[PDB]
Symmetry: D2
Subunit: 143 residues, 4 copies
């Protein structure tokens, strides 16, 4: 089914100058960007967004990196988007990422892994509403 | 010096699924996207943005096309960005556009010419302020 | 229970210069404004927001009035907010509105009735997400 | 002539539950709110907004207070709005504030002085552009 999922190009992705290349990976696989906004997250925004990891030992580092510079927030729409997105991104740890994935091609380490994608449809709903009004999301037909 | 200019990927750009290709054209040339927002313009927003051409015969059609679908608004930053942006975009009329430019590679007609870029530094300041708060624009370093 | 509901000060409310008076009505009754944004709705936004009335005969007029000028969008937080808000607003038709209500005091007619409030908690969730990101809503304590 | 100026209702204003009272002070004086947005400022936003006072000894405390809770950002429009706004707000130090002004009626101390208003027209232009796109500002007529 057609689903909507959240994608975030992390600070390292912008610094590497590959925003366009990452978006093209999605577009060519049928994941249509229907919302996009470059933003610099505050500490409160990063902490609230990653609440599910608050008990994890990497939480503090994740938050500091996520606010180290601006990120590109996006909503991708497409067939089985939640899973398709994660496949395209590749393993969380670049070392284990498959060839041709965003993380294998551009990520430096597990901490600076270039992208985030919602892990489930339930989480996607929450993550999207966290950063986008419904009025900021616009589908359009492909020609 | 380092300047900022406005770039808009028109509805036809999104419909052809080439948002990434266009952004890459800028990144590879050293024009850094420091603000990006996909938005669906209202008639009032388009008319206000293109007010200078209100006395033009194509104005009405321009507005209808500009509100026919969503667009991607962007602020590009770099050395002589206003001019560099115009070089990368190519001639307003795709037919007259040079090889390798965005309009020559992606545009279909003068009306559906894929992108808009501020024509001068004075206009850039106005176009940027029209669509972005200064707090929505963020520079960052380029590093691998 | 503490709930969040959507409130909209319609074009006529701004034209009458009573934005502050309306907000004070809420504040003094314990309905805390936790999100506020002045905005000029486009036709598509008004139509999508009032989708539930698309089959009604007043739909077209409602949409035209709602885009006639800017409005103030707000999220109110408080005890039994959905119902409390509607009580404070008063009857949809100013003619039947109770004394002391926003509509009795400021509304001109059923068409230009100054305010909108979500009619239910289910609708509140939808209306709020339509106009606000979760990151645009901020609770604060009263002192 | 008709000007636009920035007004910020500081954290203490929201905590006392007087957002409406303050906005009414402006409306009753003919200062029309043409842009309004409740927002929680980040440290970077506050520091950037108050950069001129970075060499001041109270700067650090100013920033902490300005990010301690959400604020209401507004653009006011009217004849000689910049000056009219300053009259309504009253002296920066509530103690020195005249009767009937916002600071005399609501402020607690110089640090917790309830509102900020642009001090000049030049600054207003900068402060407004910092927090609002031109497309987020909308004038309307006053009529019953
Ligand atoms: N060992 C770890 N397991 C999972 N994620 C980790 C770990 N260490 C760091 N992280 C990071 O924490 C992030 C949380 O979600 P992301 O999808 O953004 O990607 C994750 C990784 O970048
Ligand atoms: N005769 C024309 N000359 C210039 N602009 C035109 C003409 N016909 C249509 N247009 C469009 O009007 C637009 C005005 O600004 P753009 O930079 O968006 O690009 C222009 C063209 O796409
Ligand atoms: N007879 C009607 N019944 C209900 N709402 C009406 C009617 N005619 C016009 N309306 C308007 O339609 C609006 C829809 O929801 P509101 O709460 O915004 O308030 C309603 C009234 O302003
Ligand atoms: N000694 C001081 N002189 C001026 N501003 C001060 C002083 N101490 C604290 N401040 C605060 O610093 C703020 C700077 O701009 P505001 O208009 O927000 O109002 C000012 C006061 O609230």
């Amino acid at each position: 089914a057609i689903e909507r999922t959240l994608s975030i190009i992390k600070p390292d992705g912008l610094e590497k100058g590959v925003i366009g290349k990452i978006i093209s990976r999605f577009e060519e696989k049928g994941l249509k960007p229907v919302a996009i906004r470059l933003q610099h997250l505050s500490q409160a925004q990063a902490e609230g967004f990653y609440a599910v990891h608050k008990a994890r030992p990497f939480f503090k580092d994740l938050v500091q990196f996520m606010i180290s510079g601006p990120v590109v927030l996006m909503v991708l729409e497409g067939e089985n988007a939640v899973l398709a997105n994660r496949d395209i991104m590749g393993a969380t740890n670049p070392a284990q990422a498959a060839e041709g994935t965003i993380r294998k091609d551009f990520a430096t380490s597990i901490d600076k892994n270039t992208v985030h994608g919602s892990d489930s449809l339930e989480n996607a709903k929450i993550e999207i509403a966290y950063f986008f009004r419904e009025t900021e999301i616009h589908s359009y037909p492909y020609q």
